[PDB]
Amino acid sequence: NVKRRTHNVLERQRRNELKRSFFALRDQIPELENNEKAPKVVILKKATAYILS
Amino acid sequence: RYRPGTVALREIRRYQKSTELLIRKLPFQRLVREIAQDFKTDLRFQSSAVMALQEACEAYLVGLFEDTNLCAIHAKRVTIMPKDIQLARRIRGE
Amino acid sequence: HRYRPGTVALREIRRYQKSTELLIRKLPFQRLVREIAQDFKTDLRFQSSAVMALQEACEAYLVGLFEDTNLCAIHAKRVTIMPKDIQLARRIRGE
Amino acid sequence: SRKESYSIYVYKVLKQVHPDTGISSKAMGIMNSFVNDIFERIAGEASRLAHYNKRSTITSREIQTAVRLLLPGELAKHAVSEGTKAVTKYTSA
Amino acid sequence: SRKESYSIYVYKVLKQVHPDTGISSKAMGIMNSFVNDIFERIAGEASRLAHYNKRSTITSREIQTAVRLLLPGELAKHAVSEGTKAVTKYTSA
Amino acid sequence: DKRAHHNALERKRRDHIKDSFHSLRDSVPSLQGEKASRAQILDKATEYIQY
Amino acid sequence: GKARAKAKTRSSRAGLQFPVGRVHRLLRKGNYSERVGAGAPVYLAAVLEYLTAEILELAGNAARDNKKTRIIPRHLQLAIRNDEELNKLLGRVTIAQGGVLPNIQAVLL
Amino acid sequence: ARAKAKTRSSRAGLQFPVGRVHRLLRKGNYSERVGAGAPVYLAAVLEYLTAEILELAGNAARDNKKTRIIPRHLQLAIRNDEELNKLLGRVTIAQGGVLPNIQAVLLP
Amino acid sequence: VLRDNIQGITKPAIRRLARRGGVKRISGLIYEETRGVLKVFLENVIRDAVTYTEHAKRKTVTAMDVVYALKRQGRTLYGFGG
Amino acid sequence: LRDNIQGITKPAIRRLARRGGVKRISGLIYEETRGVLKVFLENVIRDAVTYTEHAKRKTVTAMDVVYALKRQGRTLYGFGG
DNA sequence: CAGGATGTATGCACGTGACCCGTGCCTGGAGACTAGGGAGTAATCCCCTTGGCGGTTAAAACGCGGGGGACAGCGCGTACGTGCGTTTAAGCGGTGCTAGAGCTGTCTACGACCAATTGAGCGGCCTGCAGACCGGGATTCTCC
DNA sequence: GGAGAATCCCGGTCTGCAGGCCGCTCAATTGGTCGTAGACAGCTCTAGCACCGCTTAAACGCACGTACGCGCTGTCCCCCGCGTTTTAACCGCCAAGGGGATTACTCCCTAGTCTCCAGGCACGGGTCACGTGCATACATCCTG
């Protein structure tokens, strides 16, 4: 069970790293500066638009 | 093979850390309903009522076993015995 | 002649369990109550009946404690009561 | 200035239960406090029962239930019988 | 079909005590049991204090005294200070 | 029934999210044609917007 | 049960020594409920009287056994602690000047 | 006294509902009359005790690397605090478990 | 008809109860003793929960009836109501 | 008024133990007993004085003692109440 | 030393459960006003408590001898703990039927409330009896 | 079987408390009206119960060894019983005054009513975290 727990906590920290990456991308885009609660799909789509612009 | 009593300490720690109920549910439902039938027939029980009974009665027995331990230690034993339960209940007033 | 150690203890147990008197001297118990009261409100007056109620409650409480304590000693296969017995009695009782 | 007590009824009950037997003032005080305590318990439990339900009135059902709860063993059975008998005689005719 | 709970105020207090920490639904049920128990203790004791003194009115003095009687140690002094502040502030306008 | 429908809505949400990630990957030169994780797509999008 | 005796007093009408009126007054003034049913104090008075009769019966027995004609607190304590139901009802109670039962444990003898 | 939004709680500075506490004091027949400052004082007390438990439960939650309070944390918060343990010493807590404690005589 | 379900309180269940309570060694007679104690405790709680149910003219024992029986005995329980 | 807990002499403790049925008393019991008694008295008297102060009296009455003991689960019969 | 079979560590895709946010709706709470009772205040009296005195006495303190008990050590034998393989019943998901809890709506029977009348019982008093107390002796328990 | 001290039984004495009587105020009872709480019929829908098949963990039965519990012994210290001395409680009595109990009067706050609006609830929608299984890449051991 220690192995299962280890995989789970490592993947849990990977999810925390991905959340830091999402929040980093969000904070980079001025349209989302105050919109801290922006959902993943909206961050991706608005980031795509901002990058193309 | 471990020195006797070692696995007991492991168990103590495991069960004190955990929160799930120790007595199996279907047997306790049968026990509660068997006891209730002596007082009144055809009673239904709310699904949460039996859980409240497990929570209280199991926590009560945990508490009683804790005092039961103290009696044995005072008598200079490690092993608990019926005298310990009887002394704990006698001083508690049960 | 001299009565054997423990004979007079049994005689005393018989005597005091037959009696119903207050066992603490009233006046020093009253002085104790007043000393304790000086922590809570300076310069109270105590009704005489309030002192008696306190004394009766305390003596009843201590007799109960000594019954429980005697059980603790006897369970330890010992005749003589010790602070271990009082502490165990109180700890089991939940004080 | 006045104060009311149960001592006269304690005395009557004793006169019926042991007709030649007296009762000291200290025993009378104890009996009086016993009546006070038991009254307070049954009334408190009847109140708790009324308020556990959505009910504003304390009735003989609240009190019968409270007596079944409060009193141990045979004492409950006899007390419940006495209460039921008294209400029956009172409401009869 | 409605029934009230203290959950919202428990949660506001939580957010003010710890700037970021959530609470499970089972823990919230426990907190509601807690609030109702403490209320019943204080309100009941305040009833006693009024009744013993032949008063009809539960006032701040009764609740303050019930708090001193019910809460141990530091909890008493701080609960009294908090209550006094709340009443003084409430009374100031 | 309604539980399975909520699970279906959540499935559809993730599908739209994977499409959005695919579009974003194709939008950043440092990942065009490359194999990358979502963390890499987000981090490279971040450092590419900075750059 | 027993046949009705005509009377003004609710106790006499109920067949009780205990005061139905005073029990009703105490229920009303004691804030136990908003409303108090008419049969409620009759039931309660009967219960209080019954319990009083039990204690006084046992206490008079203890008084006779002590060869005395007046019940005193010692007899009340003896009556309580020798009856299991009363001792369960009054287990936490202290009775002024009652003393205790003569408990000497066999291991001491 | 700086705040003066018109709910009695807000006027007192409390999160707990003063109007609700006032109903609950009028109900249950605690006495014939209830003072206006009674529910205010009482709401302040209930809020203080609630905040105390939630504080300690958050501390316990952080000690277990959790971001959410669970019954285990409430049990630990109470049983590791003498004042709360005296106040709630009779109280069984659903799924609370017990303190991690072992008697020294049982150890090597 | 439900009979003898007290035997369902197994030796391991009692052993876990005791271990959680801090116990290291358990006598073979403790199982017989603990079942008796548990039966007494359950009888006293269930009798009252049934009494509340019967007073309310219900046939279903609720978690609130159990909580009221426990509150009454001085063993108050949180999480099932208040 | 200081050191009045010494007013509880060894014989008083011994007599209370005799009513408790005790044959032999070790020498450490007396100090432990006084500690236990003083704690009990402090709790009861603090509550009695609390009732006295709430009632704005300067005099403690037996009823205050009774109402203090009731809250401890120790109902006392004999002094009113 | 290189490559295959296996075990280990990592990343990706999916389903389950929980949480957070937003919308519409109603009950509940507050605001303004009134009348009424309860509690606050002053003035007064008497009861009870506080304090002190003197003398008598049991009860407390002290020291000593002595006996009985509390304490540590040792060895014997059992009952318990610990580990394996087989058997049993719990736990899970699923399906269907129905008892009862829960709610609404109608109506009568009951208790709150009031004014008027009355007696049970409370407070104080007088009187006599069961209890406590003492002295004297015989019977029973304790120590040899 | 004997000598001695503790306990009880018996008669005689005095006292404080129990028990009964009188006048009386206040709580209990009577009779009626009014509004409400509760009893009752009826209906809807959730929660409880019964049953089934399947997978799997937990309990059961068994054999084996030793930590522990029990009993026995020897030792030394500590508590009791007792006698002698010292200390403070108890009792009875007196005096001073503070503070509990009571009434009479006034004012302020709380209960109740009516009107209106805002906060909290139930519900649905969207997002999130988490655990599980599959595909991929990396490290250890075997063969020659």
Author numbering:
A (entry chain M): 353 to 405
B (entry chain A): 40 to 133
C (entry chain E): 39 to 133
D (entry chain D), E (entry chain H): 32 to 124
F (entry chain N): 23 to 73
G (entry chain C): 8 to 116
H (entry chain G): 10 to 117
I (entry chain B): 21 to 102
The study reports:
To directly examine differences and similarities between bHLH-PAS and bHLH-LZ proteins, we determined the structure of MYC-MAX bound to a nucleosome substrate identical to that used for CLOCK-BMAL1 with a solvent-exposed E-box at SHL+5.8 (MYC-MAX-NCPSHL+5.8). A cryo-EM envelope with an overall resolution of 3.3 Å positioned the bHLH moiety (local resolution of 4-6Å) similarly to that previously observed in the corresponding CLOCK-BMAL1 structure. Unlike CLOCK-BMAL1, MYC-MAX does not contain flexible linkers adjoining bHLH and dimerization domains. Its LZ directly extends from the bHLH domain towards the solvent, where it does not interact with the histones. Although the DNA-binding mode and orientation of the bHLH domain are shared between MYC-MAX and CLOCK-BMAL1, both complexes differ in their histone interactions mediated by the dimerization domain. Accordingly, the relative affinities for NCPSHL+5.8 in TR-FRET counter titrations are higher for CLOCK-BMAL1 than for MYC-MAX. The palindromic E-box allows MYC-MAX binding in two orientations, with either MYC or MAX facing the nucleosome. XL-MS identified cross-links between MYC and both H2A and H2B, consistent with MYC at the histone interface.
The basic helix–loop–helix (bHLH) family of transcription factors recognizes DNA motifs known as E-boxes (CANNTG) and includes 108 members. We focused on two structurally and evolutionarily distinct bHLH members from the bHLH-LZ and bHLH-PAS clades, represented by the proliferation regulator MYC-MAX and the circadian TF CLOCK-BMAL1, respectively. Structural studies with engineered or native nucleosome sequences show that MYC-MAX or CLOCK-BMAL1 triggers the release of DNA from histones to gain access.
